[PDB]
Paper text:
Aerobic RNR (class I) depends on the ferritin-like R2 subunit to generate a catalytic radical in an oxygen dependent reaction; the radical must be transferred back-and-forth with the catalytic R1 subunit, which performs the ribonucleotide reduction. Radical translocation between the subunits proceeds via reversible long-range proton-coupled electron transfer (PCET) in a transient R1-R2 complex. In a recently discovered active metal-free R2 subclass, denoted R2e, this tyrosine residue is post-translationally meta-hydroxylated to a 3,4-dihydroxyphenylalanine (DOPA) which serves as the radical-harboring residue. From an experimental point of view, R2e from [name] (MfR2) represents an attractive model to study active radical states in RNRs.
To circumvent photoreduction artefacts, we used [name] serial femtosecond crystallography to determine the structure of the catalytically active radical state of MfR2 at atomic resolution. The active radical-harboring protein was crystallized in batch to produce a suspension of blue microcrystals used to collect room temperature serial femtosecond diffraction data at an [name] source. The resulting dataset produced a model of the protein at 1.5 Å resolution, and the electron density map allows unambiguous interpretation. A short H-bond between DOPAY126 meta-O and D88 is present with a O–O distance calculated to 2.41 ± 0.05 Å using END/RAPID error analysis. A striking conformational shift takes place upon radical acquisition between DOPAY126 and D88: the dyad undergoes a coupled coplanar (but not coaxial) rotation of ~22°, with an additional rotation of the aromatic ring of ~12° along the Cβ-C1 axis. It results in a 2-Å displacement of the para-O carrying the main radical spin density, away from D88, and a reorganization of the interaction pattern around DOPAY126. In addition, a clearly defined water molecule (w1) mediates a new H-bond between DOPAY126 and the ε-ammonium group of K213, which displays a different orientation facing towards DOPAY126. In contrast, in the radical state of MfR2, this water network is disrupted by Q91 which undergoes a large sidechain flip towards D88. Our data suggest that Q91 could play a key role as it obstructs the putative oxidant channel in the radical state, preventing radical quenching by further oxidant access to the active site. In the immediate vicinity of the side chain of DOPAY126, residues L183 and F187 undergo large conformational changes in the radical state of MfR2, leaving space for the positioning of three water molecules (including w1) and creating a water-mediated H-bond network between DOPAY126, D88, K213 and Q91.
Residue numbers in the entry:
A (entry chain A), B (entry chain A): 1 to 307
The structure:
């Protein structure tokens, strides 16, 4: 009989929904005075207060440390970081922006535009490190190595087709696998170096990148769970099967890449365990149980501390 | 005979191009150490150093000023700003993100993710103003008015179909029309109030929004001109015809809306001239000549100063 508060919201659509429906409906503005899910406001406040730029970190203080490393190890660092910059590039320009039309709330739509911009800043910060420490030849040979190393490329090629959003839940899982899983095999190396007193200022940038990417992974898992809980029991079963199948395939690709990257340095076995440990955390973030054994996820305490 | 510097760039594609080509090619990371167009670096540096959040502005200092306004004028401000928040919402979630795959350079792809995030901040800042000054009833009735006012909706509905990117140059023009043209009929009102000593702290937020949106318009015009200059003379003619046809149609829609919004307050005639003045600047930003007369673009010096 009586009008409810904010009835206009039920008689309108967001602009992206207007487009998805084929251009029908009355469009509403975002309402930041009525937040439908308090978690959206909490995350908005945290990610915007955490804004940073790499020019504030004195990476040049690392030059003495960098010059004590052999050319082989300088090459390893440049290659590893350039491979991470590729993942950043995919997230910023494809994966995170593809989540905007997958949103449950108006406020979530713009939180993912923050995510995409901040992982662009992460890619910029790797550039800033190279500008300070590397020679032009080191930089160019790392970019050549990235495009020509098939084990590296295959990890990226496995995930990009899901961002076409044929299925919004599969897209969201494929997006979260970047900051929630593929990050960690590369971050093993700065954690290893930091524990041995090398490149302390570079490590500060690594920790700022980590602070952002952890929230990106958490928020995607939160929205995944809220949507999956509304599906039928058999659709929930199909989604759980897809997640495990995709993750197992990606672990195989990641193991092959980390072996190629690290084997000559003796770091491959430890980095793979570090990666699989974080695959277990990734599943828990989606509301699933981890199947991995204690032995295959063992981490050195000094790496756990750096984390 | 000899390899050129950065040959890898010519043998690879960005991730969005890999997707556009149907999943073929070797993917390259962004290279922030080799910037192909120096203008991209300049704009990246400016927009990131200009980061701001509305919580830093003491809008509560405007309460005394706000309480001297009649309820009719408080309603006008709330309606006008909520209509601007709708435009912000379209830019953040549809228009600016649609420019990422239209880019000429890798660096441009992530500059547009910054644009989308910052116009989300603009929408947030209008919310922040309402939280401080408005009653809950004022806020709700403005959202109801936005969805139910056809002259307001028609301006948005005219532009959204171009963001599907059937034509990247038409998409880019439709994107730039938001910060480059539709902004100004709404910004007439805070400029009018500020010139009369009302709401000085709100005006500071307006000027921060303006500082961002001006760069958004400029950068889109720069990339429009660089691409159009590579087309055949007859394709350049077709594009110029489209721009003028679309702008003239949008001016008609904007005039109808500003008359409905402002006529009872006596502000409509001045606001329309202010709008058409900026339509002339919009054409110049795309490399075209303005056809508008001095009489139809006349601005009060006090408004020109506020600008």
């Amino acid at each position: 009989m009586a009008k409810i508060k904010n009835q206009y919201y039920n008689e309108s659509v967001s602009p992206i929904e207007y487009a998805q429906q084929g251009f029908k409906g009355k469009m509403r503005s975002v309402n930041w005075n009525v937040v439908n899910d308090e978690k959206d406001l909490e995350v908005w406040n945290r990610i915007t207060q955490n804004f940073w730029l790499p020019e504030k970190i004195p990476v040049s203080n690392d030059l003495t440390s960098w010059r004590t490393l052999t050319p082989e190890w300088q090459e390893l660092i440049t290659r590893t970081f350039t491979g991470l910059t590729l993942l950043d590039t995919i997230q910023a320009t494809v994966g995170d922006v593809a989540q905007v039309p997958n949103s449950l709330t108006d406020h979530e739509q713009v939180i993912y535009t923050n995510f995409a911009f901040m992982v662009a800043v992460h890619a910029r910060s790797y550039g800033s490190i190279f500008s300070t420490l590397c020679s032009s030849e080191q930089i160019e040979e790392a970019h050549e190595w990235v495009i020509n190393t098939e084990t590296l490329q295959e990890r990226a090629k496995a995930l990009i087709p899901y961002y076409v959003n044929d299925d919004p839940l599969k897209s969201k899982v494929a997006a979260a696998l970047m900051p929630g899983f593929l990050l960690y095999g590369g971050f093993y190396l700065p954690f290893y170096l930091s524990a041995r007193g090398k490149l302390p200022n570079t490590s500060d940038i690594i920790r700022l990148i980590l602070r952002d990417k952890v929230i990106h992974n958490y928020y995607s898992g939160y929205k995944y769970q809220k949507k999956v809980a509304k599906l039928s029991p058999e659709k929930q079963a199909e989604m759980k099967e897809f997640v495990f199948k995709l993750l197992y395939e990606l672990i195989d690709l990641e193991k092959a890449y980390l072996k190629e990257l690290y084997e000559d340095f003796g770091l491959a076995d430890d980095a793979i365990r570090f990666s699989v440990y974080n695959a277990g955390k990734f599943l828990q973030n989606l509301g699933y149980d981890s199947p991995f054994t204690e032995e295959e996820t063992r981490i050195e305490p000094e790496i756990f501390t750096q984390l």
